């Protein structure tokens, strides 16, 4: 049960990364670390912490929009 709660905390942390990245105002601070795949990479760790196929597909799209937002301003 300690384990369950620990994984749940980790899961909610990554889910909240995606919520934070929804907002345009949060991109400049977010873009300082992890590059365009910052959210693509967190999604891999969320999939290990447990995610439904439906939520994965949603966040797969959000992670691609993050990359697009990142390239738009920081890309070569």
Curated annotation (Swiss-Prot):
Q: What induces it?
A: Expression is induced during host plant infection.
Q: Where in the cell is it found?
A: Secreted; Host nucleus, Host nucleolus; Host nucleus; Host cytoplasm
What the record says about family reads:
Belongs to the RxLR effector family.
Q: Tell me, in a sentence or two, what this protein's role is.
A: Secreted effector that does not produce a statistically significant enhancement of P.infestans colonization of Nicotiana benthamiana leaves.
Q: What is known of its domains?
A: The RxLR-dEER motif acts to carry the protein into the host cell cytoplasm through binding to cell surface phosphatidylinositol-3-phosphate.
Q: What is the name attached to this protein's record?
A: RxLR effector protein Avr-vnt11
* Source organism of the structure: Phytophthora infestans (strain T30-4)
Part of the intact protein present:
72 to 147 of 153
